[PDB]
Each structure stands twice: as C-alpha cells, then as structure tokens.
Design a protein around this nucleic acid. Structure first.
Ligand SMILES: [Mg+2]
Ligand SMILES: [Zn+2]
Ligand SMILES: [Zn+2]
Ligand SMILES: [Zn+2]
Lengths: 112, 180, 98, 491, 156, 96, 44, 171, 87
DNA sequence: CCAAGGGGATTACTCCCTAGTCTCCAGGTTCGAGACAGAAAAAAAC
RNA sequence: UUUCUGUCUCGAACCU
C-alpha cells in the first residue's frame, strides 16, 4: 500500500502541470524506492546507504567517507555496474556490453 | 614477463602473501598438485601418472598424429629407431629448438620398456595397487631390488605397502624389463 | 659577545667577565690559576635568573642554592680545566657527561 | 604511454578494498625518504633521499626514472615511504577506532560480549559486515567492564570461565584528534597502547567485526609508516625558471617530515614526556590536515600564503573533486562547440558543420583496397583545403604531419595504415545541448560540411534539444572508430 | 614547586629572556622593599617557542608581562611536579617564405599577402587584406621587396 | 571539451557503451598500467626496453598484467594508496 | 531502464511551474521526510 | 616429473588473419609460444598431446580493438624437479667446483662438500677427471644424483645434487 | 566451469535480435572489413565498411556469435545466422 | 498459621531533548591579481 | 638538414 500510494503521489505531482509520463517510469521509481524493506529515500542517507559497488556509491555525495568505509570493511566492489566500469574506463555492460561477440569457427570454415 | 598460462583451479588467492607449502617428497605437494584434478567438462577425477615408456609412447602417438595432420593439410635395436626419431623430429620442428632434441635423447637411451603390450600390462598391474600416482610412477621408473633400499629411496612410502607385496611388484617389474 | 661559565653556569656579558668574572667562583679560578675567558664558553643553555637560590627548588636541582642570585646555566658546553676539576671533587659536568 | 609490452592485455573486473600493512608499504616502496628538502641543494635536481627523489619518478624529461628507466610519459610513479617515529591515528577511521575500542577490552583485547549472550548471538547472526558491526557496537557500549564469566543456560549457579581481563572498560570521549578515556582517572589513550591492543585482538574477534585477516585488520587502521606519492601525483608549477612553486601536497609532506625528524631527535635525546607529547600532537595534526582538511572543531592547516592547504580529501571531495570532475565526467578531444542557427533546407537527421571545424576535426580511417584511391587523393590534397588529412599513422605507430611534410604526395599509403582525414559529409557525429536534461538531448547527426562559422541544424530537432538559436551554443563530438560510428548510426 | 610554561613566538626566545630580566632589574632599581615575586625565568632551545617561569601567583606574571610583545600570556599551563626532574635534567637535546607577395590568377588578385608556410607547389599566404589564409600556387605570385615598387616574378 | 555527468547519463541511456568507452579512454586519456596478480597494485617495475617485468614485494616475475585505464583513474588509485586505501585489481572471479 | 526512468521523471520536473505541488512536492516525495508541509487525508 | 595436466592459453590474433587457414596459423603460433618454454609456477612444458582432438574454444573480440582472443584448452606432459627425488644423468662439463650433470632439459650441480672422501679431482688426464677407490667419474659416464634444491629462473631451472647414500654414483 | 553454460536447447532468450546486438555486430564487422578481413558477400562496388556489414547482416552471412549473459554469469549461446533480425 | 504488600534498592529496558554533517543546477566565455615578506648567517671578493 | 610549447590558484563579470 505504501508503494501504491507513493506512485499515486508521484503521478499527482507529475500530472498537476498537465505533463504525462509513461506509467512504467513512475513504477520503476517507486519499485526502486521500495525494493528494500521500507522506503529507500533518494538521498545521501538512503539508496547510497545500500550495499552496491563502493566505486558506484562514492560517486554520489559521500565520496571519501564511503571510500574509507570500503577500505575498513574490505568491500569487494563488484564492477558489474555503470559507475565502476566508467571509472575503470572499460565497456560498461550498458546495452552493448550486455553480451560478447565471437567467431563462428564452425561456419567460417563451413562456407569456404 | 610474457603471456603466462592459465589454469582451472580457481583458488582463493586474494592478497595472500607467500604462503606456499614446501615442496618435498613427503606428499606435501604444491597448490596445483592435489590428488584430485579438474577435467574438460567440469568433472573431478584423480591425478593420473605414467612411467617413462608410457610417456615416450604417448609422445610418439602425438607426433605421428601431428605428421598425419600436416600431410592432410598440405594435401589440399638402438641404431635405427634413434635415427627414425631423429629425422621425425627434424621434419617436425624447424631445428632451432634443441630442447626437444636433448630431452628426446635423454629418454630414448635409458628407458626400459619398448612395447605397447608391455607398458599396458605394467599400468594394469599398478592399477590394482591404488597407491599415489607419482609414487607408482617412481616404482615403475626407478630400479629397485630390496625393501630397505626402496624405503630409503622414498621415505614417504614407509607404512603404505607391506613387505611381501612390495617384493612381488619388485620381482614382477624385474621380470617385465625388456631385453632391448 | 656574551658567554657562560663552564664551572657553575653564570652568564654575563663579555665586558662584565673582563671586569670581574664570576664573583661566585673568582676564588676557585684564582687558586686554579685559570682566567675566566678560557673557562667560559659561547654555546650555553638553560639560563635561569635566580633571585632566591636558598628557597628555590630549581636552584637545588642545579646545585646553585649555596651561591648568590643571578644567572646560572643548566647546559654549558666545553670541558672545564682539569686543574679545577681535581680541585672540585663534588663537581660534576653540566653538559650531561659523566 | 605507448610501447610494445608483453604481459597479457585485459580489463579489470573487480576492485577489492582494504588497508596496507606497514610491512606491505615497506615492501612496496622503492626508496626511503628522510630529508624534507625536495631539491635545489648544491644545484642538482637529483636530490637522493628527499621528496621528489628520482627513484620515485622522473620529475622532468630527463629520459631516466632510475627505477624503471621509462621517461615521465610512461613511468607510473613509484611510492616512497617514511617510518613514523610513533604511530599516528588516521583521520578517516578515528571514529572506527573509537567504535572498536568501545567494542573490545583495552587490556585483554577481546570482545566485551561473546556467544554467551543471546543478544550477542542474534547480533552475530547478521551476515552483512556493516550492520553486524553496528549491532555489535550498540550491544558493547552498555557493557563497561571485561567480565570474567557469564551465566550459562545449563544452570544459573554454574558459570563458564570465558576468560579475559577483569578491569573496568573506560568511557571514551572525543577531544579534537585524540581519544580521552575515563575509568575517574581521565587520560589520553596513547596511540602505542591502542596499537598494541589492536594487534592483540584475536582472529575470530576482529573477523566478527567488519574486518578480515588478509584484507584489513584493525591493527593497520593506525598509521605507523606513511606512504608518499610519487612526483606525478605532486607536479610542480612554475612562473618561469626563476620561480617554481611546489605542490600543496609536497609542502605537507615536507612539513610532516620535519615534524617526524624533530620527534625522532626528541626520542633519541632526552625525553621530557611533555615536549614529546607536544611534538606527537603536532605530527598527528600535520598528518591529519594532510589527509583531511575538514576536521570538526579544529583549525584548518593554512599554507604559507594563508589559504587552506589542498588535502587529498579535498582533491576527492566535491564536484571539482576527482571522482565527479575527472572520472564520472571528464574532458575529451575530437570535439567542437559553437553557435546554432535554424535551417529548414537541411534534412532532419543532418547537421551543418563549419568548414573550419571540419578542417580541424578528423576521423582515423584505415587504408583498405576499398578506399585507397580516395585516401591517397585526400593525402595528396593535404590539410589546407577541406577534403584532406593532417596526420598519417604508419604501421610502427609514429605519426607524420602532412603540413610539415613537403613530400606529402610522394608518400605512398601502404596497407593497414591510418589517415586523419577531415570529416566529410554524411559522417555520424553526436550533437548535444549542454543542459542535457533528458535522453533525446544527445543525438547522432550526419555531417554536412557547410561554409560558414555556425552550426546549422534542422529546425524540428530544436524541441528535444530545447534549443532556440538566441545565442545558444551546442556541442559536436566526432567518433573515432567503426564501433563508435556504428553505435551512433544504429542506436 | 610552582612552574608555569607560556607559549611565545619561536626563534627569539633569548631576546625575550634578556628583555624580561632588564625590565625586572629596572623594576627592582625603581622599587623599594616590595619586589615582584619571580623566582626565575628560562627557555628551551629544542622545545622552541616556549618559556618557563616560576612565580607564586598568576597575577605576578600578568603584571610582569603586560606590554611584552611576542608572548602569549593567554596561553599558559601547569608543569607537573613529577615532570620537573626530567625537564631540568642536564642531558637534553625557401626564399619565398616570409615575403610580401601579390596574387595573380585567383579571386584575390592584386592583393598583398605574406607567405606563412609552403607545403610544396602550393604556398599558403595570409591575405594582407582579409583575415583569412589561402593556398595558391607559388609560381603565379609576383613577389615584392620589403618596401613597395618594382614587382619581381619567381626567379630569385 | 568535457563530457559531463548528464551527458554520460544520456549515453548510458542510449546504450552506446562503445561510444562511452572510446570517449572516456582513447579520446581523453589512455594509460597502460602493469599490475601484479598476487597484490593487484600499481607496483610493477616494467622495463619494456629490456622486457623485464617484476613486482618486488611479491617476488614474482611471471604473473603481470597490463590494463588500460584513464590517467585520472590511475591517479585516483595513487591517491588512495597515499591515503592508506587498497585499490586491488585481479584475474579471476570468486563469487562466480 | 533506470536511466530512462530518471530522465523521464526529471524532464517534467524542470518545466514544472489546497495541498503542496510542483518541485517542492517532488523533492518532498523523493526525500522521504517525516515532517510534511501540508499533510492531508481523504476519508470516504 | 612427467605427468599430464590440463591447461589453457589465451592467444591474441589480428582481424587481418581470418581466412579458413587461421587455424593452421594459430597452431603454428601455439607451438611457437609453448614449445621450449619453462616457468617456475608450472615447470617445464615438454610436449602437447592429442593434436587432432584439441577442443578449440571460441574466440573473443576485444571491446574496442578488432583483435580476437582465443583461449585454447589442451593437455600436456610437463617435467619439474622436487627436492629429495633421486634421478640419473650425464656429465656435461667439468671445472674445479665439481661437474654438471644433464638430467632431461636441466643441469645438476654437485657441490664439493657433498662428495665422498675417497673421491677427488685429477688434472693429469685429458680432460680432467675424478677418481675414487672403486669408481671412475668422467665426461662419458652415467651417474645417479639426489636433488637437494631447485632454483627457478625466468627461462630455466637449476638443480643442486649430492651423492652420499648407498647405491649412488657411477652405475 | 562449463555447467553455467546453457546448451543449444532450453534457451529462454529472444531469437529476435536486439538493437544493441545489431549495432555491435555492424561495428565489429566494420572494424574487420576496414582492417582487411575477408568479405563474405559479393561486392557491387561498395566501399563503406558499415554498408558492407549491413549487407552481410541482411544476408545472414556474418560469422559471429553472442554469449547472451544471464546475470548470474551463465550465458545462452546464439548464432547470428539463426538470430531473426526482424526489427 | 496465612496472603498479600509497600517499598529497599537496585537492576532492566523504554521514550523523549540539544549539539554536529552536508548539500543547495548544466555548462561555456573572457578579465584581473596573487604566489607573503623580513631578517640574519655563510660566502664573495673590493 | 638543428621542432611537439604550457601552469596553478583565488575571484569577478557575462552567455545559454
Ligand atoms: Mg536559448
Ligand atoms: Zn620508474
Ligand atoms: Zn576483559
Ligand atoms: Zn605484488
């Protein structure tokens, strides 16, 4: 019911000015803000208190504090995420890094 | 240095300092040298060992297989076997790589078994023992005549095989030695 | 210009040392046959201007409670003349040696 | 840099965090630093032993690092180290030091609670390191004595000898950069005793907290041996030759080394135990301002010029900081910015590019049989007129400048080579308006070289860009690869 | 004992002691029976920037050090009684390049220019009329001396 | 020019991962970094002229890996190692 | 998806012009605030 | 010491070489990279077996570079000495410090302090030889030595040996 | 470990090609043709590697495969010839 | 006998109040001033 | 037949 009412508020504030946004964007917003047990505020103290990659988390507000906590708690930053792959300067699995590209030794030999 | 060579045992080698166990004859093997090895398809089996004659034989089977592959691709008593091996190796590689040459001379001149049936028979008899593959390779490779000499040879294998079965494998190997 | 006495630590200007030297130890220098300029040294430290050596505990620490109020240096570099050292058995070096 | 290496080429796909051990820092360092003066002594740049020690990294184009012999272009800089004469708290973890101190005994080095308390077992059931430590610490604050035994559930009267010291545990309070403990015989806890008790913590004990035995033990949370960055992290700046100013970090390092040499002399000579306390306070303060300039309730370190000194926290701190200012968003070549004007005689997905901007911007095109004739013509034409190139990248990797080469026509384009031909028409180029409020504000357009000084863009694409031609400016990014062009044209 | 240590400006400590005593001795010379109660004052080189003073009450040191620069009277502290023996122990411490030219078969004909660079068979000239650089074949340009006058073709 | 956070987002939305990689590595700043397998630190004394590779402090000469990273990411890591934090980089997965 | 949702929720926010509404309300929504400027209840 | 282990290697190959012969090419390069190499970690790689059935795993195009990384899986016979095993070899060269014994692809050094009392040097023969009361050691002579220590260099392995226990030496 | 890999059957991902796969493949073929790889199609004077790549994809003559990474690390193995490039 | 009974006098938790973090678009363009300065000791050489 | 300069740091004003 919290998720439903929260979506209802976001729909109300969006539609007050007459602008229309597709439902699934608001649905994702409420679903990320409710995927944890309670309300993960989109705040310095909210989603960035979760347990994602340290390099991803540090790019938001608390940079050096989260980096020290990562050093102390010995976090294995996953590198499955956008900000860590961007920091490392490698192809983040965005839409094009979401797979790999190979060579059909089979068919390359079959035609010729 | 250069492109190293990979391995399947995805150990937990995270940050760990030099903690490698000593490498001695008392079964305190290295991190790769477990009794249990990984397979092609993710299966787990035991480490497999082999005697010197079996080693040369599999090397020769590999080499003749390579010669057959090369031929297909381009299509579209101590005095003669050594020369045949020599010319086979020369045709195989360029010649600059002496390493194969020195090793192959080292193996040809003091190996004991020469025949597929004999080496097969040896491995079937060592299969029944169920002892550790490196150790059975030692018994099949090095020559022994007495229990005390064998035990001082391999101090690890002291309370693992009793004297009578030790002597049986020894005399059996001694009889199975081929007369060249 | 200004120097410090090796023996007991009194500090005065060069003109004052030429004038009278150490009134506290003028007698000891006179017996030992050494003038004040050779017993004084340029590098010194710990200059306490004592007004009541009898009551002050600092003067007892520095072994100057029996003498008259004035400058006294805790640290006075150099080596006192050996003649004065033998004339003063209870004297110990003020530079941390011995 | 660029040079043929031999190790395998690959990408990173993890980042494990932790703390160095002092043994690790000593093992990794290439040189020991002991002289606070950085250079200019006896008019020799190679100041062995000081800051900017040449073994740490080449300070200039000397062509010699003398650790790697690689030149400043390639040498990644090598870390120095300095054994601090007494251990020093690390500002970022000082609160964590306090938390661990409230958690464990200050003498026997064992957690105040153990699995003999039901609350402690429930706290230990938490898998996550952070929440587990939080539960442990909220449970361990209440206990204020290392008890020698707990009631066991087998019988109330029978108790188990869990072991450890008997002393009362202090209440710890924050005063500046130091921890005071009250038992009330209040006193400052010495960093030596705190280090010793941390090292005496047992393996299970600190692994139970948010620590690990190979990653980061609480013992190395305190700084005994400081690692010093190499010169590439502390580059010099210069008016001219006559005035060269060193970096803020270099000055902090020199100041720390002066504090440490003073403290080392004070240790070696007579030790009053109050002047040594003052020097220890000074050196902790200096390390603290060096690593963090935003302490609560303490004066900030001022530089010689009176402005706050630039700390590593500051260099990572804000938008201008390193994470948000050089990694999330950074700079790039092969790009242009200029004014936009409407143009109804341009196709919707087309964009007009000034002739000058086309002349400067280039796409590296590789020589094939399928474009050899046109590429040879472009090279022959050269960089001065539009259809042409500036650079020709040979196979060895070196670049030849066509403007400075008078034999440009005589150059023959062997195969595999590349040319930096100017962007021609029908070339994908991203086109962006800087308030990138939403997704469609960055779209790939086809270049139309158009002689004038202003980007021209079809009018109907002004809505998603929120552009108005009222002095607006827009941003053109030229892709440098066939992947890049294919992505921009197809996606 | 009663011994208090006061912060001061580093490096001038002996000058501070000498001035303090000269003030004390002048105060004694002017004053009669009731003198200021300052048992002694001293400094420490290696613990630079600090003075040590003995006196019974803080008002004495305040009434002594008023008007004394480079001393922080506000910053003073007790020396512990246990700490004194250790503090007082003795053992401590192309010719066509850069020439005026006139173009002859182009839209910019009759126009002065300055040759900036030559890439071979084509000379780049900045126009001495327009704020634009142009490439044109160097053979078809008539070059002029440093001053105007006779126009020499490409024969130099 | 600069590729701000908002424009990074726009490319992330586009899905042009190749574009972002090219734009933040090859067109901005590309640095080759040798690292040791055991430690995963930037402590490799690479002599490419002599082809002599070693991470002293781990005693290895054979298990050395180059990575391409931005110089800004390099020098972030250098600051972290200056600030008692470990940037560790490795050749395997453990969780799988 | 996530970045798409972010842009699509943030685009109307920029052009955003009884109970609270507009950008203050959107900020209040995302920054889950125990205190609320104009709380309301509709009981049927 | 002559065992068979499953290993794998990543090979970097260029777009330019994508014809149907890239397999025979990749193989010649494979043998180029592995035949004759040695490493401390894995040991000496003497040969690769069962050529015709090698499962060539599929390649990998690099994210921005055009190159293809093929991780080739295979099994091979490797040799690596361990302290305390006794092995036999041939004298390759002599000097005042002792003599080097060739054992497979490696040379074994027998230091002077681990040699019998009754066995000593003699330069009156051409080449210099070693004599005993009941043995004669020379260039063309096979001898049994026990490996006491191993030193692994970048592209080589060194072994130190001794001859003291019963039944060792000239055979 | 191969157990994470899914065999040719029991694959649950879409045979219809994704725009990102299309874009990556066109780019990868574009590098290969630009750097002298063999061309699997008769060329009617085409000179732009991207156009040659689109032509090969139209004829399903691209020797490329996709590991379709399941997020747990497993992958589904899908060949370009069989991938229905409808769009 | 009995059955509560009011605290003794500590436990146990529980729930409320003041002082400290850390923001507060996305960008470009030029332009200007500031890299303390004072003072004394070692060394140069009229 | 001799070429890859070069900067920081505090602000101010203005453009979208
Ligand atoms: Mg506008
Ligand atoms: Zn170097
Ligand atoms: Zn205890
Ligand atoms: Zn290492």
């Amino acid at each position: 019911a919290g998720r439903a009412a929260l979506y209802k508020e976001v729909y109300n504030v969006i539609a007050s000015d007459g602008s229309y946004v597709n439902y699934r964007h608001m649905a994702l917003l409420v679903d990320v803000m409710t995927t944890q047990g309670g309300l993960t505020s989109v705040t310095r103290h909210g989603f960035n208190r979760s347990n994602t990659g340290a390099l991803m988390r540090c790019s938001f507000e608390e940079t050096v504090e989260i980096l020290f906590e990562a050093g102390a708690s010995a976090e294995l930053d996953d590198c499955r995420g956008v900000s860590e792959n961007v920091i490392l300067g490698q192809m983040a699995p965005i839409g094009t890094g979401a797979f790999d590209v190979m060579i059909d030794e089979e068919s390359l030999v079959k035609y010729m | 240095m250069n492109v190293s060579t990979s391995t399947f045992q995805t150990r937990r080698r995270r940050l760990k300092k030099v903690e490698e166990e000593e490498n001695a004859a008392t079964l305190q093997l290295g991190q790769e040298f477990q009794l249990k090895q990984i397979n092609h398809q993710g299966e787990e089996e035991e480490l497999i060992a082999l005697n010197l004659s079996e080693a040369r034989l599999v090397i020769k089977e590999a080499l003749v297989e390579r010669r057959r592959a090369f031929k297909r691709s381009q299509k579209k008593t101590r005095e003669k076997e050594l020369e045949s091996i020599d010319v086979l190796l020369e045709q195989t590689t360029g010649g600059n790589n002496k390493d194969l040459k020195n090793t192959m001379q080292y193996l040809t001149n003091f190996s004991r078994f020469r025949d597929q049936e004999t080496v097969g028979a040896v491995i079937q008899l060592l299969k029944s023992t169920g002892l550790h593959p490196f150790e059975v390779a030692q018994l099949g490779s090095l020559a022994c005549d007495t229990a005390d000499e064998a035990k001082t040879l391999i101090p690890s294998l002291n309370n693992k095989i009793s004297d009578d079965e030790l002597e049986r494998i020894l005399k059996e190997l001694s009889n199975l030695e081929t007369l060249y | 210009s200004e120097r410090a006495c090796m023996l007991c630590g009194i500090v005065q200007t060069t003109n004052e040392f030429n004038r009278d030297g150490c009134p506290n130890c003028q007698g000891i220098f006179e017996e030992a046959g050494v003038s004040t300029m050779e017993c004084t040294s340029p590098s010194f430290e710990g200059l306490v201007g004592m007004c009541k050596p009898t009551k002050s505990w600092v003067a007892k620490w520095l072994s100057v409670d029996h003498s008259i109020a004035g400058m006294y240096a805790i640290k006075v570099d150099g080596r006192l003349p050996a003649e004065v050292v033998e004339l003063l058995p209870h004297y110990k070096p003020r530079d941390g040696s011995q | 840099g660029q040079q043929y290496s031999s190790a395998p080429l690959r990408t990173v796909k993890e980042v494990q965090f932790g703390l160095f051990s002092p043994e690790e820092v000593r093992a990794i360092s290439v040189a020991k630093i002991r002289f606070p003066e950085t250079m200019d002594e006896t008019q020799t740049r190679a100041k062995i032993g000081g800051l900017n020690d040449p073994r740490l990294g080449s300070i200039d184009r000397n062509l010699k690092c003398q650790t790697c012999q690689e030149g400043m272009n390639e040498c990644p800089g090598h870390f120095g180290h300095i054994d601090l004469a007494k251990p020093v708290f690390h500002v970022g973890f000082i609160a964590k030091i306090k938390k661990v101190c409230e958690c464990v005994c200050m003498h026997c080095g064992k957690l105040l609670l153990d699995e003999h308390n039901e609350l402690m077992r429930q706290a230990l059931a938490i898998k996550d390191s952070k929440k587990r430590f939080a539960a442990i610490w909220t449970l361990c604050k209440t206990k204020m004595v290392c008890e020698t035994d707990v009631p066991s559930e087998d019988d109330p009267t029978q108790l188990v000898s869990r072991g450890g010291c008997g002393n009362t545990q202090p209440t710890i309070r924050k005063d500046g950069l130091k921890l005071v403990g009250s038992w009330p015989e209040l006193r400052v806890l010495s960093t030596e005793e705190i280090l010793n008790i941390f090292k005496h913590i047992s393996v299970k004990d600190f692994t139970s907290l948010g620590f690990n035995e190979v990653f980061s033990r609480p013992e190395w949370m305190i700084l005994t041996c400081l690692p010093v960055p190499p010169p590439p992290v502390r580059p010099s700046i210069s008016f001219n030759e006559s005035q060269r100013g060193e970096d803020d970090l270099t000055f902090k390092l020199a100041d720390i080394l002066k504090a440490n040499i003073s403290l080392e002399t004070l240790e070696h000579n007579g030790a009053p135990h109050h002047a040594i306390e003052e020097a220890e306070s000074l050196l902790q303060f200096h390390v603290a301002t060096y690593m963090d300039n935003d302490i609560a309730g303490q004066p900030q370190a001022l530089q010689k010029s009176g402005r706050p000194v630039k700390s590593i926290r500051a260099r990572l701190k804000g938008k201008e900081g390193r994470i948000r200012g050089n990694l999330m968003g950074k700079r790039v070549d092969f790009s242009a910015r200029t004014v936009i004007s409407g143009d109804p005689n341009l196709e919707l997905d087309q964009v007009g590019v000034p002739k000058s901007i086309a002349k400067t911007l280039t796409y590296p095109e590789v020589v094939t049989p399928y474009n050899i004739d046109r590429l040879t013509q472009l090279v022959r034409n050269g960089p001065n007129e539009h259809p042409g190139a500036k650079y020709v990248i040979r196979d060895s990797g070196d670049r030849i400048d066509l403007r400075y080469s008078k034999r440009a026509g005589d150059i023959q384009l062997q195969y595999g080579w590349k040319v930096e031909r100017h962007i021609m028409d029908n070339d994908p180029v991203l086109f962006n308006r800087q308030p990138s409020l939403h997704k469609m504000s960055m779209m790939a357009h086809r270049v139309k070289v158009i002689p004038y000084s202003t980007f021209r863009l079809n009018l109907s694409v002004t809505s998603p860009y929120n552009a108005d031609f009222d002095g607006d400016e827009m941003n053109l990014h030229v892709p440098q690869s066939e992947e890049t062009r294919a992505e921009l044209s197809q996606l | 004992a009663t011994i208090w240590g006061v912060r001061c400006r580093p490096g001038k400590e002996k000058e501070l002691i000498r001035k303090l005593l000269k003030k004390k001795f002048n105060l004694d010379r002017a004053m009669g029976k009731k003198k200021l109660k300052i048992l002694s004052i001293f400094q420490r080189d290696n613990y630079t920037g600090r003075i040590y003073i003995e006196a019974p009450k803080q008002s004495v040191i305040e009434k002594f050090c008023n008007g004394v620069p480079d001393i922080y009277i506000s910053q003073k502290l007790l020396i512990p009684v246990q700490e004194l023996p250790l503090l007082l122990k003795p053992n401590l411490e192309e010719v066509a390049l850069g020439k005026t030219v006139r173009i002859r078969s182009a839209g910019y004909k009759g126009q002065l220019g300055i040759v900036k660079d030559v890439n071979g068979d084509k000379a780049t000239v900045e126009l001495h009329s327009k704020n634009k650089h142009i490439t044109i074949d160097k053979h078809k340009l008539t070059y002029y001396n440093r001053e105007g006058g006779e126009g020499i073709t490409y024969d130099e | 020019l600069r590729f701000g956070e908002m424009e990074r987002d726009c490319m992330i939305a586009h899905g042009a991962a190749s574009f972002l990689k090219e734009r933040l590595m090859e067109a901005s700043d590309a640095f080759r970094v040798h690292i040791c397998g055991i430690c995963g630190l930037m402590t490799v004394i690479a002599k490419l002229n002599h082809n002599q590779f070693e991470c002293k402090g781990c005693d290895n000469k054979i298990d050395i890996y180059q990575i391409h990273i931005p110089y800004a990411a390099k020098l972030l890591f250098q600051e972290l190692m200056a600030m008692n934090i470990t940037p560790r980089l490795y050749t395997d997965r453990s969780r799988d | 998806v996530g970045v798409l949702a972010a842009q699509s929720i943030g685009e109307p926010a920029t052009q955003m012009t009884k109970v609270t509404s507009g950008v203050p309300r959107l900020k209040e929504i995302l920054n889950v605030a125990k205190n609320m400027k104009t709380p309301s209840l509709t009981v049927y | 010491m002559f065992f068979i282990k499953d290993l794998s290697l990543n090979i970097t190959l260029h777009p330019s070489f994508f014809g149907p012969r890239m397999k025979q090419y990749l193989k010649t390069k494979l043998l180029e990279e592995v035949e004759g190499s040695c490493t401390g970690k894995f040991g000496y790689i003497l040969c690769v077996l069962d050529y015709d059935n090698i499962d060539i795993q599929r390649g990998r195009i690099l994210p921005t570079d055009g190159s293809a990384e093929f991780n080739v899986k295979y099994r091979a016979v490797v040799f690596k000495p361990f302290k305390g095993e006794v092995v036999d070899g041939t004298v390759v060269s002599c000097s005042q410090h002792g003599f080097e014994v060739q054992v497979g692809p490696m040379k074994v050094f027998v230091t002077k302090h681990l040699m019998p009392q009754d066995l000593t040097f003699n330069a009156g023969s051409n080449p210099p030889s070693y004599q005993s009361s009941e043995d004669v050691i020379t260039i063309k002579s096979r001898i049994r030595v026990k490996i006491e220590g191993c030193i692994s260099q970048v592209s080589s392995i060194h072994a130190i040996g001794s001859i003291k226990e019963d039944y060792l030496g000239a055979i | 470990l191969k157990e994470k890999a899914i065999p040719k059957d029991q694959r649950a991902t879409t045979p219809y090609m994704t725009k990102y796969e299309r874009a990556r493949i066109l780019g990868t073929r574009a590098l290969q043709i630009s750097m002298n790889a063999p061309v699997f199609v008769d060329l009617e004077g085409e000179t732009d590697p991207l156009r040659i790549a689109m032509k090969e994809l139209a004829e399903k003559k691209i020797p490329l495969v996709i590991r379709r990474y399941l997020p747990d690390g497993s992958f589904e193995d899908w060949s370009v010839e069989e991938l229905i490039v409808d769009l």
